Amino acid sequence: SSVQTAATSWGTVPSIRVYTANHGKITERCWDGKGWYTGAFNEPGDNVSVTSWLVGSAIHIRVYASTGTTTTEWCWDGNGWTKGAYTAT
Amino acid sequence: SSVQTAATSWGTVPSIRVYTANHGKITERCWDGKGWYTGAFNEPGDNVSVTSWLVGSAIHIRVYASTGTTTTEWCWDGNGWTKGAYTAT
Amino acid sequence: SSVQTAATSWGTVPSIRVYTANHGKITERCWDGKGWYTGAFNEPGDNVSVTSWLVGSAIHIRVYASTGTTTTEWCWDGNGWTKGAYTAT
Ligand SMILES: OC[C@@]1(O)OC[C@@H](O)[C@@H](O)[C@@H]1O
Ligand SMILES: OC[C@@]1(O)OC[C@@H](O)[C@@H](O)[C@@H]1O
Ligand SMILES: OC[C@@]1(O)OC[C@@H](O)[C@@H](O)[C@@H]1O
Ligand SMILES: OC[C@@]1(O)OC[C@@H](O)[C@@H](O)[C@@H]1O
Ligand SMILES: OC[C@@]1(O)OC[C@@H](O)[C@@H](O)[C@@H]1O
Ligand SMILES: OC[C@@]1(O)OC[C@@H](O)[C@@H](O)[C@@H]1O
Ligand SMILES: [Zn+2]
Ligand SMILES: [Zn+2]
């Protein structure tokens, strides 16, 4: 079925991250001003949303991956992807 | 059917808002730096998107809730959710 | 099927762009503080996401339009929409 994307950007270059839910798997493509490349994020999901914010020049990213009625938060704080404290209720 | 989410964030703490369209109903979870709690937003929708912007330290949120071919805009400007002027045509 | 939207905003007025994927067609509605109107963007797609950034006072917008397993990026840089370099792999 048709894939589903979510996008975020930061700075003025800019950096862009595009997340794609594709048949149960979410992957990440990256732009930092000089070509698209595959990012490290790879987790299960039928649906994806994202938001990001800067603290100074350090980017923080939250990706929300949903399967069925279960949503899992993934956190990027500059040094690795980790599961977040988000709960749905 | 998997639920569908949309997310926005502001500031450096940050504040995060996650909207979940769950089989026709959109609810909202909130992070302001010290735990996830349920927000005031409760409206019908199969699909949801969001954007937000700061005027000084005041957050303004716009949520776009879609059912069928009807999209309703909901506005947070500090003191309650109100229907916005958005129309598709 | 219910339509699916993506929203972005910039400035303090603000300007808002809302993209709606509606049965294969993505269209755009615009707010610059003085009423909603229809924007130039009109391209095919079953799913849509968007991000934007400012460089000074100039807005740059990226719309990710997906049909099947194909995602096409559309770029606004002040002077018309053009296809972007985004690729999924
Ligand atoms: O520089 C690329 C990278 O480290 O940027 C932050 C996140 O997007 C990561 O998944 C990604 O691999
Ligand atoms: O740094 C991780 C974290 O504390 O960031 C704020 C929220 O995203 C939380 O759910 C998350 O666990
Ligand atoms: O402090 C929580 C709250 O008031 O923040 C602004 C909006 O997200 C509201 O729906 C939400 O209840
Ligand atoms: O104050 C509310 C409002 O004027 O804000 C800007 C746009 O979101 C409009 O649709 C909306 O009615
Ligand atoms: O002034 C309206 C407009 O030029 O703004 C930038 C883009 O949203 C365009 O599609 C749109 O027509
Ligand atoms: O100016 C257009 C462009 O170079 O902007 C940055 C990225 O969005 C690229 O995919 C895109 O082609
Ligand atoms: Zn279901
Ligand atoms: Zn339909």
Residue numbers in the entry:
A (entry chain C), B (entry chain B), C (entry chain A): 1 to 89
Anything the authors wrote about it?
Here, we describe the tsclx4-/Zn-directed assembly of two proteins: cationic α-helical cytochrome c (cyt c) and neutral β-propeller Ralstonia solanacearum lectin (RSL). Sulfonato-thiacalixarene (tsclx4) provides possibilities for protein surface recognition (e.g., lysine encapsulation) while simultaneously supporting a metal site that can bind to other features on the protein. Whereas sulfonato-calixarene (sclx4) consists of phenol monomers linked by methylene bridges, tsclx4 is bridged by sulfur atoms that enable metal coordination. The metal-binding capacity of t-butyl-thiacalixarene has been explored extensively.
The other model protein was the neutral, trimeric β-propeller Ralstonia solanacearum lectin (RSL, MWt ∼ 29 kDa, pI ∼ 7).14 The histidine-enriched mutant RSL-N23H was selected for this study as it can bind zinc. Co-crystals of RSL-N23H with tsclx4 and zinc were obtained at high calixarene concentrations (15 mM) only. The structure was solved in P212121 with four RSL trimers and one tsclx4 in the asymmetric unit. The four trimers assembled in a tetrahedral arrangement, similar to the assembly of a six-bladed, β-propeller fungal tectonin described by Varrot and co-workers. While the fungal tectonin tetramer was assembled from protein–protein contacts, the tetrameric assembly of RSL-N23H was maintained mainly via zinc coordination by His23 and the adjacent N-terminal Ser1 from two protein chains. Here, the calixarene adopts the 1,2-alternate conformation, with one zinc coordinated on either side of tsclx4 and bound to His23. His23 forms stacking interactions with two monomers of tsclx4, and a coordinate bond with zinc (Nε···Zn = 2.2 Å). The zinc ion is further complexed by two phenolates, one sulfide from tsclx4 and one water molecule to yield a trigonal bipyramidal geometry.
